[PDB]
């Protein structure tokens, strides 16, 4: 069989890629940022506590207006909150109680949900009968749905446990594009600000960069030793951050095609569930399984503070567009705002 | 108050939504959740005569509602969706007594589920389905087919006792769980009653543990 020749060619290509990456590693980010003065200790206090959910909270998503919020819990309810007044605007019953993700449309007219049912449900918020009703039920995945993000009112990207990602149109409800190439369950995805590229992380300890137009992988970032549970994107649009089960986070650049920085400490021995950046991009907030959220300096690897006050696992984490506040959700059936 | 009229109306709407959430939660609280597991030939789909996502079944016997979830359809890695079932009353494991390879990977699944890092305080109702059919089969052929190391006579008693002792001996977390083993007859009419008894017992134990009286 000539499969051995193909394997040898693939190994040679891997060696070439490794050599090319190593050649570009002239120095380290720490050497450049040595002269940077520290951010300073951050003191954040819980401003608003949102009550009403009666089960573990699995996901949340901020609104574009920076005032509305959407949350999902296993009780079987989708809740829209007004953060300022702590008022419930909408409560939505779900057919399947097992939900693990939610999304908010950029225009604020639609919401999305999905989970172990292998369907992505799209609900319409603006209607003439004054009620929220199902607009679509996108089907076509073989495994559980992990994440979903809107591009506009017409298109949506999902990732699922069939080791696949998908781009869907909505007025036809058909699988427009399919992204394959992973070997393990895809757990997260994050849209670039120019909504033309995105990244995904899977249980094969890898992350991949996809172009929405073409539909094929361009770059593959590796270096983790376990599953990647969360992924974010740098505000500029040229780098991203990851979180894995071996209690570390890493920063990967697009142009250099290699990691620049790793955020680990001896006391932290638990995995990361969520990750996000601030408006400027020098603050990296990451939830953990020790009932805590840690804020790292994105350039110098110095824990600038903690966000304690949750009695269970921190599942979902989100930073507002204007950068005013951070929102966390926990398995203890509570959402909190830390400004 | 310093609010306007529309603000007061929004607050009233929020209060109504809160009331509805309270009633729905109190209604959902009056239910018992069970994790139905076993081989495809075990007979889990026919466990209770009272009767692609998660398979769901619901039945009420003697003023108690039970929702059984079958999650064998989910072929992804169990590590990343098994924590969604940590808050369930019990795991109902059905074993096919007759088929031998079937019962073998049934032991594999039993050990895997019992030794999880999440199900460290939950109990198993083990239904030994196909009792008399396998009894006749074991009259025909010994248990050496799979339990080759096992030494015993051709009688059904010794083979069944060995199989039950095995399935209870793969357990390691004997400190905070208790297996309820039931020989399942073809026309068994005590299945729902047995589930009722087990659920009541485990809920009493749960009260005892939270109150610290156990």
């Amino acid at each position, epitope marked *: 069989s000539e499969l051995d020749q193909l394997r040898q060619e693939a190994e040679q290509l891997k060696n070439q890629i490794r050599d090319a990456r190593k050649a570009c590693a002239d120095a380290t980010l720490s050497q450049i940022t040595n002269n940077i003065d520290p951010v300073g200790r951050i003191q954040m206090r819980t401003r608003r506590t949102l009550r009403g959910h009666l089960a573990k909270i699995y996901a949340m998503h901020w609104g574009t207006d920076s005032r509305l919020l959407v949350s999902a819990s296993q009780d079987g309810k989708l809740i829209i909150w007004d953060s300022y007044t702590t008022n419930k605007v909408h409560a939505i019953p779900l057919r399947s109680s097992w939900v693990m993700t939610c999304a908010y449309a950029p225009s604020g007219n639609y919401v999305a949900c999905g989970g172990l049912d292998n369907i992505c449900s799209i609900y319409n918020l603006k209607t003439r*009968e*004054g009620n929220v009703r199902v607009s679509r039920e996108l089907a076509g995945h073989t495994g559980y749905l992990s994440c979903c993000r809107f591009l506009d009112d017409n298109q949506i990207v999902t990732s699922s446990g069939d080791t696949t990602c998908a781009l869907w149109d909505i007025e036809t409800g058909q699988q427009t594009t399919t992204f394959t190439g992973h070997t393990g369950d895809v757990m997260s995805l994050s849209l670039a600000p120019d909504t033309r590229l995105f990244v995904s992380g899977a249980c094969d300890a890898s992350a991949k960069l996809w172009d929405v137009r073409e539909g094929m992988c361009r770059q593959t970032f590796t270096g983790h030793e376990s599953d990647i549970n969360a992924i974010c994107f740098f505000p500029n649009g040229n780098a991203f951050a990851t979180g894995s089960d071996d209690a570390t986070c890493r920063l990967f650049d697009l142009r250099a095609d290699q990691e620049l920085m790793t955020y680990s400490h001896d006391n932290i021995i638990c995995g990361i569930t969520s990750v996000s950046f601030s408006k400027s991009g020098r603050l990296l907030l990451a939830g953990y399984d020790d009932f805590n959220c840690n804020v790292w300096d994105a350039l110098k690897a110095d824990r600038a503070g903690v966000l304690a006050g949750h009695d269970n696992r921190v599942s979902c984490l989100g930073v507002t567009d204007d950068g005013m506040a951070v929102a966390t959700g926990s398995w203890d059936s509570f959402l909190k705002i830390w400004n | 108050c310093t609010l*306007s009229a*529309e*603000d007061k109306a*929004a607050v*009233e*709407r929020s209060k*109504m939504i809160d009331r509805n959430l309270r009633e729905d939660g109190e209604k959902a609280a009056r239910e018992v959740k069970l994790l139905l597991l076993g081989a495809d030939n075990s007979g889990k789909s026919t466990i209770v005569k009272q009767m692609t996502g998660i398979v769901e079944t619901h039945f009420t016997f003697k003023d108690l509602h039970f929702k059984m979830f079958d999650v064998g359809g989910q072929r992804s890695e169990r590590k990343k969706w098994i924590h969604c079932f940590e808050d369930v009353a019990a795991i109902i494991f059905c074993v096919d007594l007759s088929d031998y390879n079937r019962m073998h990977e049934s032991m594999k699944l039993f050990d895997s589920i019992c030794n999880n890092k999440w199900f460290t305080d939950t109990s198993i109702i083990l239904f030994l389905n196909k009792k008399d059919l396998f009894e006749e089969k074991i009259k025909k052929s010994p248990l050496t087919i799979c339990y080759q190391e096992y030494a015993g006579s051709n009688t059904y008693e010794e083979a069944a006792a060995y199989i039950q002792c095995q399935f209870e001996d793969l357990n390691k977390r004997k400190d905070t769980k208790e297996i309820y083993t039931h020989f399942t007859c073809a026309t068994d009419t005590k299945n729902a009653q047995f589930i009722f008894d087990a659920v009541t017992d485990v809920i009493i134990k749960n009260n005892l543990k939270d109150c610290g009286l156990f």
Partner: single-chain antibody
Amino acid sequence: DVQLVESGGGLVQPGGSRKLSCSASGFAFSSFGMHWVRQAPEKGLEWVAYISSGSGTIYYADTVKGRFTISRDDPKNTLFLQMTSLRSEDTAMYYCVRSIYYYGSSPFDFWGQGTTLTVSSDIVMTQATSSVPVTPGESVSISCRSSKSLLHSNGNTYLYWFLQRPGQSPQLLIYRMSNLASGVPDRFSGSGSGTAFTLTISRLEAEDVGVYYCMQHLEYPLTFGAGTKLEL
């Protein structure tokens, strides 16, 4: 389609009683508060009554307090106004109007059709102009005023704009002085300064021939303007 149909009016003698009814169809009646609003035979619109969703808060005007009772039957999609001790001042046409309240909702969006009854601390709105001769393609700017500033600490200016075409029920145009309602021509615009407000219409058409009203929603009772009429 949303339809509020009211019936129960007619001719009554002084001192009588009548129970007007209002049937809703095509929307969730349980989530909407309802207002009863009357218009004199030849005059402007006047507020009467309001009942909230869930029947938790009820408001009546001073004039019709003690004699009018507002009720609703959510399981039957019906609203009732029971009137006792009628007088000649009560002759009018009555409308049902729906309202819903959350962050970013449009109240007073859909009005009824009208039922006629012919018997045998308040903010004052100011719409001084009454008749405006107009030509298609021109621009018009209706203005109105207030007694107390309609701006609140939350940052919202509670002013609403309505247009009544000849032989038609009033239609919402603008809510909170700047937001255009759904299904309204884009040529309409609204502006305000907290005490004085203006509605501007570019590219005037035969459609925009009718009476324009401005209303305040800052506090109860809700008060209307006299009405400025644009006619070709």
